[PDB]
Amino acid sequence: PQREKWSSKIDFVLSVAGGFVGLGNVWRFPYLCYKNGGGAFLIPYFIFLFGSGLPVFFLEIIIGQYTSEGGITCWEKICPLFSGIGYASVVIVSLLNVYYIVILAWATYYLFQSFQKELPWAHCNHSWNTPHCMEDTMRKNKSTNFTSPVIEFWERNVLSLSPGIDHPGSLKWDLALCLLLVWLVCFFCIWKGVRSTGKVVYFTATFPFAMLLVLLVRGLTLPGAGAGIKFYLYPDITRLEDPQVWIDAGTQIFFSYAICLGAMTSLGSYNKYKYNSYRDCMLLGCLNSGTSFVSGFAIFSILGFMAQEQGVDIADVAESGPGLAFIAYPKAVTMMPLPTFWSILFFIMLLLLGLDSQFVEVEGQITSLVDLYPSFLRKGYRREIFIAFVCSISYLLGLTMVTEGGMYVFQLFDYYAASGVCLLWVAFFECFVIAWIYGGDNLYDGIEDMIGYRPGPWMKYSWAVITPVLCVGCFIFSLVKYVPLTYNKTYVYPNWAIGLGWSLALSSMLCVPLVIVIRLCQTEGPFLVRVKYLLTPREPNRWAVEREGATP
Ligand SMILES: CCCCCCCCCCCC
Ligand SMILES: CCCCCCCCCC
Ligand SMILES: CCCCCCCC
Ligand SMILES: CCCCCCCC
Ligand SMILES: [Cl-]
Ligand code: NA
Ligand code: NA
Q: Partners of 417 in the beta sheet?
């Protein structure tokens, strides 16, 4: 048959809006900004945003709309060579689906722990609390070994933090069941009712932002909000010399915008050919970076309040890693009237933000993979088995991040698997093929015939120069001034862990050069003609059903 289109223009936006607005906004951005000093994170953040994040995102959407194909076959239509971008995106999204559901596992654990008379992380008098812990209020009344009850609950119970990655400890069975419960939710929403949230689009979309306004209002009114915003906004120039801030902020754009995954291309392939997706992406792009920036005020206002209460530096008040959103926001809900009621709403909001995203990415790779075998899959019970196998295998690998030493594996996956040099590798090759091989001006003829008008030269230069320079320059300068990954600024990773971590990056990076080798080997003839035949697009806009022109 043919790839079914969206039922309406509104269906495309809500699916895309919930597909890349989520834990990448309210969870990953706050601690990446917190890790890389304060406001020095924002200059690379906005530079990468307006240089490549919007351009590459629109490029993927427009490629999907042009080819009417998924993550992988879109590149096959665009360019038979460099078709390994699809497989690299599939590997990246596979690892992302492996490690991104652990955040929802932790969120479910907090949601379950929240159904009590008193929130467990308000006061530290429980079994897991070390004798060093004491309350934030009486911290000033009472060196540098006095931990707060909030960090204790996250480390010494929820995580049961192990001394290192090479001490995995014992699997946390409570978190494994929470990990299975969210995976069962995704499976039961992917197999039946691929897009079944249409009845409650009003609540399932507006509430996550409605809660974000509530947290923002509470955060700004706190006594210590002044120092937090100055920490969040005012940049430190000396930190711009470290290449890590450019890598972190550079790939936080690519992470938050879900590009180089094949989900955007799949989402962009489900809309009409004669649909103006240029304007909607910019409005959708504004919603993402607006959410990350505005919610950044909320969490960083809490950090200033926490630092003021404890009388410690803002940079030393919480965890410089994943779990800042789990240390700041659960502290914010404590100061609210009826703390239990709001804490339930926050972690329900946190769940709805990521569940909608996980639905898109999991379906993105499933749709991308079934394109490889349209006959073997997408027919009867063979999709039932295949989707479960993807979810079951990806769940078992997620168990390694649930054990007591599971946090350290989480930082490895977070830094390497679906972020960092792997994203800079695919994003560079996405733009390099389009701008220099396919032709930036050559694609504009398709886009102008598609949205009805020719957009400005912003996209042309971003793919041609800005994105390759930003990707290549940051890739080179990261290795030149190499710094090993660390967890919470203290833990130094063992050599094999970094070697394992680089395998996660190289597992998808090596897809691009490999597929070139197979493509060259399969093609018969002289080497130059072999290459020349493999760069000719195979009629990407082969859809006479919708009015169109010739691709060349
Ligand atoms: C060209 C068709 C087959 C492509 C397979 C490439 C290998 C992908 C997986 C790499 C190691 C996980
Ligand atoms: C990490 C989970 C890996 C799942 C990928 C399944 C690929 C099946 C090829 C048809
Ligand atoms: C981590 C492995 C990803 C699976 C990709 C398979 C593509 C055929
Ligand atoms: C907290 C939600 C903010 C959304 C802003 C969108 C326009 C900048
Ligand atoms: Cl962002
Ligand atoms: Na979402
Ligand atoms: Na995002």
A: none
- Helices 9-20, 277-310: inter-axial angle, 10-degree rounding: 30
Query: What is the helix (H) or strand (E) element at residue 98, kind and residue range?
Result: helix 84-113
Placement of tokens 């879900």 in the chain: 258
CA 419 / ligand 2 centre spacing (Å): 19
295 CA to centre of ligand 4 in angstroms: 8
Q: Give me the sign of the Cα torsion angle 31, 33, 35, 39.
A: negative
39 CB neighbour count, 10 Å cutoff: 19
Atom of ligand 4 nearest to the CA of 298: 1
Give the CATH number, domain containing residue 335.
Answer: 1.20.1740
| 390 Cα: distance to centroid of ligand 2 (angstroms) | 6
Whether residue 486 is contained in a domain is answered as yes
Q: Say how far apart CA 552 and CA 549 lie, in whole Å.
A: 9
Query: 416, 168 in Cβ contact below 8 A?
Result: no
User: 129 alpha carbon to ligand 7 midpoint, in Å?
Assistant: 34
Q: Which of 128, 105, 95, 93 is nearest to 402 (CA)?
A: 105
Total structural domains within the chain: 1
- Pick from 218, 226, 256, 229: nearest CA to 343: 218
Q: Three-state SS for 262? A: coil
Lookup: tokens for 203: 């609540």
Radius of gyration of the chain (CA): 23
DSSP labels, 161-207: --S-TT---S--HHHHHHHHHHHHHHHHHHSS-TT-GGGGHHHHHHH
Ligand 4: lining residues by beta carbon, under 6 Å:
209, 212-213, 286-287, 290-291, 294-295
Write out the residue range of the structural domain in which residue 131 sits.
9-534
For tokens 């971008």, the residue is 85
Q: How far is the CA of 187 from the centre of ligand 3 (A)?
A: 19
Quick one: residue 489, left, alpha or beta (phi over 0 = left, psi -120 to 50 = alpha)? Answer: left
Is the CB of 97 within 6 Å of ligand 2?
no
User: According to DSSP H, which parts of 221-270 are helical?
Assistant: 225-233, 243-256, 263-268
Within a domain: 502: yes
Residue from 93, 508, 511 to probe ligand 1 pocket by mutation (most atoms less than 8 Å from CB): 511
Q: What is the dihedral of CA 256, 261, 13, 205, to 10 degrees?
A: -50
Within a domain: residue 171? yes
Planar angle of CA 240, 482, 102, nearest 5 degrees:
85
* 550 within a domain of the structure (yes/no): no
Do 249 and 36 touch, CB atoms closer than 8 A? yes
The whole-angstrom distance between residue 360's C-alpha and the CA centroid of its chain comes to 12
Tell the residue nearest (CA) to atom 3 of ligand 1. 515
